[PDB]
Every structure is written in C-alpha cells, then in structure tokens.
C-alpha cells in the first residue's frame, strides 16, 4: 500500500493569516491519465467532508480561499485568509491504487488572544450523597489556549486519584476551549473533609484560578 | 475512454 | 440532500451487526457508496465500496472476510455488515456517496459501534447549583454511550458547554454547563433534559437553589 505522509501534525494560525499543509506519496499518485488525490476536513464532531478532488478541483460548497496543488509524489492544500470555521483535521487521501490510503491528519487550531477560564466549583448534590458516591465538579470554560493544568486540593493537600478531566474541541465560533474536572470520592471520605479547591494553572495569570467551598 | 474502477462513473 | 446512517450500536464480542445508510434527494446507483472507519484518536481507515448498479463490491485486504457490503436500490439504502466482532471494531463508521464523473459528494453522519460484553445501565442525573451565572447537571454511571443533554428542551443552547463522556468504573460519566444571566435564574426555571435512547430513559431535572 501507499504510505501518505502528512506534514505537519499540528498547525495553529490567526484569523486572516495564510495556512498550508503538505502530503507526500511513497509512490506517484498519477495513473494512466489524471491523478486521484483528495483532501478532506473533519470539523469537530462532524462527518468528514471532501474539499478537493483530483489534486485541484474544488468540491461544491468550499470557499474560493481553499486551493490544493501538486503532482506525482508532492501535494499541498492552501488556505488564505483563515477563518474560525476552518478549525478541523485535514486528511490527504489517495485513490490511485487500491487499497486507497490516508494521511495521518493535520490538526488546525485557530490562534487567538489569550483568555482565562471562567471557573466554577460544584459540591456533590444531596441526591448523590444519599446513594454513597460524591462527586465534586469543577467547570473551566472559555479559555485559550488548550494547555491548562488543573489541580485538586482537599483541606490543603493535593489530591490525585479520582480525578477525571474532559476537554471540548476548539469552538468554531468563539475559538475558545472548555474543560470539566471531576473529583469523585466516597460519602465517608467526603464527610471526613472540609475544604475543596479546584486550581487552574494556565498561561494567563501566573498563579492559579482557584474556585472553592467549605463542607 | 474508460472510468477508473471504483473511482469514477460516466 | 442527506445520507442518514442508523443509530449507535452496542454488541457483544463475537456477534455481528448491520449498519444502514439511507439516501434522500439522490439515488445510490449514481454513486459508489464507500465505508470508512474512524477509531477514536486515530486515523481514517478505508474499508472499500459497493457499486449499487451491478452490486460490485471491493473490500480492502484488511477487511476481507470481516465485512459485507450490500445495497437496496429499491429503498435507496446501503448496508455494511460486520461479522465476528472484536474490541478492534469499536469505532465510528461513515458511508460516503462519492463519484468522480466523466463530481458531487455526500457523507452520512456516521454510526458509532461499541464492542462490549457489558450491560445497558441507565444514567443517574445530578443537579449542579452554585451579571451571569453557571448551572449544570451531572450524568453519571450510564452505559452504553450516547446520552444527550439539551437545556429547556432546546430553547437554551447559547452558552451551553457539554463534554465528551469519560469511561471509568466500566460506565460513562459526563456533564453539561450552561451560563445564563443571573436575572433569568432562578426567576425563570432552568431545566436540563437527558436522553438515553439505549435504556429508553428521558430525564427532566430542575436546577433549584440549594
Ligand atoms: Na452519465
Ligand atoms: Na481507524
């Protein structure tokens, strides 16, 4: 099969600036006639979409801003200017030989003005305590960039087991990310402590944002 | 001519 | 102008399942229906095609004897049967009506197949109460995925954050935030709706102050 080598793996661009991704075929993707090279894009949690077929032909719907180029072993996809709604994973796909083959992906981040997470902490609810579990939920919304570190303190001691984190994909519309962190204990260990603290360390403030409650 | 198998149709 | 694929599937290690992909606004003998596997935090694998005009099929060597493509050009539907399932078959499966003419192209919204020998467990829905203000609900310990959270039955959607389910204890846990102006609440009820088709459960939950 043909190894398709997408470069780079990751790409962060400001709105309005240009963008270019590369694709290398380990063989020429020109049959006898035209060259069956395609580009797709998967906007976050959406089926993939085909942008470009046959190296250069724009697929109905794609804006004039996109264009792809190449021949034989080398191909690139161009954007310029870049916009919010281009956030996605780009794939080069070849059809010159069965089995047809796919690049590894190129992940497109919109780079924007840094923004700090809006944070809130939520004590376990009564309804849950009655059942034996206790979960402290901390929401960390609308921040940029993605890399963010979250830390839980129970009565002043760092705590590491029980914490599950989950990130949304980059928001096509406002270009921020968002995060849940969730400290799950047992009702008795929850009752044994007093102070619960969720601390966001991000590139924004120096020291963390820290939401908290007592009891 | 002739449409590449699996790929193209008239 | 839509391909619709069938709903999410949970099925045992060993069984078979059948995925459907139904067109509207074109016929599927004008295209090749392709199938494409997306393992979560990995690449698209191509599985092959069916030409619903001669019922020709071609599978990729990795999927032969694992995969059966069929098509019903009478109800304009394309089929992908997967056989003797394994953990490696846990993925999302898209059908693509696609053809280079001598073009134009459609994608289905995809079908999530989950290979587990575990059991349907409905969620527990927990309320999350504290310019503007943030509210949420916690959806804990259900199985399989998905669940869906809307807010006030869809009317609220602006400033809703809803996170990918995470696996732990062999069930999923997720949650949703919604941020409203603190005049709107609690002066006007904020409710979160939770659908778990797999257990046929629906939960409305009001966010009252503590
Ligand atoms: Na024709
Ligand atoms: Na895959």
Keywords:
heterotrimer; A: 215 residues; mainly beta; Immunoglobulin-like; 2 domains; 7-stranded mixed β-sheet; 4-stranded antiparallel β-sheet; 2 helices; 19 strands; B: 10 residues; 20% strand; binds sodium ion; immune system; FAB; IGG; staphylococcal nuclease
What portion of the residues of chain C fall into strands of 2 or more residues? Answer: over 45%
CATH topology of the largest domain in chain A: Immunoglobulin-like
Coarse morphology of chain C: elongated
The CATH architecture of the largest domain in chain A can be given as Sandwich
Largest sheet of chain C: 7 strands, mixed
The named CATH superfamily of the largest domain in chain C: Immunoglobulins
Largest sheet of chain A: 7 strands, mixed
**Structural class assignment of chain C:** mainly beta
Broad CATH class of the largest domain in chain C = Mainly Beta
Domain Ig-like (chain C): 11-95, 123-208
Disulfide bonds (chain C): 21-95, 137-192
Protein name (chain C): Igh protein
Keywords (chain C): Immunoglobulin domain, Signal
Describe the structure.
The complex is a heterotrimer of chains A (215), B (10) and C (210). Chain A is mainly beta. Chain A folds into 2 domains: 6-111, Immunoglobulin-like (Sandwich); 112-215, Sandwich (Immunoglobulin-like). Chain A has helices at residues 126-129, 187-191; strands at residues 4-7, 10-14, 19-25, 37-42, 49-53, 57-58, 66-71, 74-79, 88-94, 101-102, 106-111, 118-122, 133-143, 149-154, 157-159, 163-167, 177-186, 195-201, 209-214. In chain A, the strands form 4 sheets. In chain A, strands 2, 4, 5, 6, 9, 10 and 11 form a 7-stranded mixed sheet that branches. The longest helix of chain A has 5 residues, at 187-191. Chain A is elongated, with a radius of gyration of 23 Å. In chain A, 37% of the residues are buried. Chain B has 10 residues and is an all-beta fold. The N and C termini of chain B lie close together (10 Å). Chain C has 210 residues and is mainly beta. Chain C contains no helices and 19 strands. In chain C, strands 2, 4, 5, 6, 9, 10 and 11 form a 7-stranded mixed sheet that branches. In chain C, strands 12, 13, 15, 16 and 17 form a 5-stranded antiparallel sheet that branches. A 4-stranded antiparallel sheet of chain C has the order 1-3-8-7, with no helix packed on it. In chain C, a hairpin with a 4-residue loop joins strand 5 and strand 6 (56-59). Chain C is elongated. The A-B interface holds A 31, 33, 36, 95, 98 and B 1, 4, 6-7. One sodium ion is lined by residues 37-39, 42-43, 45, 91 of chain C.
């Amino acid at each position: 099969d043909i190894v398709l080598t997408q470069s780079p793996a990751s790409l962060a661009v400001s709105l309005g600036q240009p963008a270019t991704i590369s694709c290398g075929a380990s063989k020429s993707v020109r049959t006898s006639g035209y060259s069956y090279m395609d580009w797709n894009q998967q906007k976050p949690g959406q089926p993939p979409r085909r942008l470009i077929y046959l190296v250069s032909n724009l697929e109905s719907g794609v804006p004039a801003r996109f264009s792809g180029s190449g021949s034989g072993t080398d191909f690139t996809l161009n954007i310029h200017p870049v916009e919010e709604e281009d956030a996605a994973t780009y794939y080069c796909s070849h059809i010159r030989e069965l089995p047809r083959s796919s690049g590894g992906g190129t992940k497109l981040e919109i780079k924007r003005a840094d923004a700090a997470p809006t944070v809130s902490i939520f004590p376990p609810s009564s309804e849950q305590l009655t059942s034996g579990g206790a979960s402290v939920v901390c929401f960390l919304n609308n921040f940029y960039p993605k890399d963010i570190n979250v830390k839980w303190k129970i009565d002043g001691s760092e705590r590491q087991n029980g914490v599950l984190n989950s990130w949304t994909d980059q928001d096509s519309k406002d270009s921020t990310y968002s995060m849940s962190s969730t400290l799950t204990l047992t009702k008795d260990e929850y009752e044994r402590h007093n102070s619960y603290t969720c601390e966001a360390t991000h590139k924004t403030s120096t020291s963390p944002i820290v939401k908290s409650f007592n009891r | 001519k002739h449409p590449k198998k699996g790929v193209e149709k008239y | 102008v839509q391909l619709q694929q069938s709903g999410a599937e949970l099925v045992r290690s060993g069984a078979s399942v059948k995925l459907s992909c139904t067109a509207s606004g074109f016929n599927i003998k004008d295209y090749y229906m392709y199938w494409v596997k997306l393992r979560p935090e990995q690449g698209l694998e191509w599985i092959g095609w069916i030409d619903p005009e001669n019922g020709d099929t071609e599978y990729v060597p990795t999927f032969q004897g694992k995969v059966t493509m069929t098509a019903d050009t009478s109800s304009n539907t394309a089929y992908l049967q997967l056989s003797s399932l394994t953990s490696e078959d846990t993925a999302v499966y898209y059908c693509n009506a696609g053809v280079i003419t001598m073009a134009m192209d459609y994608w289905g919204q995809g079908t999530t197949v989950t290979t587990s020998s575990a059991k349907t467990t409905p969620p527990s829905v927990y309320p999350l109460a504290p310019s503007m203000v943030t509210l949420g609900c916690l959806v804990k310990g259900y199985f399989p995925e998905p669940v869906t959270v809307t807010w006030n039955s869809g009317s609220l959607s602006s400033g809703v954050h809803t996170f990918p389910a995470v696996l732990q204890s062999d069930l999923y846990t997720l949650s949703s935030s919604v941020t409203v102006p603190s005049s709107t609440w609690p002066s006007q009820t904020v409710t979160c709706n939770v659908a778990h088709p797999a257990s046929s459960t629906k939960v409305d939950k009001k966010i009252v102050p503590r």
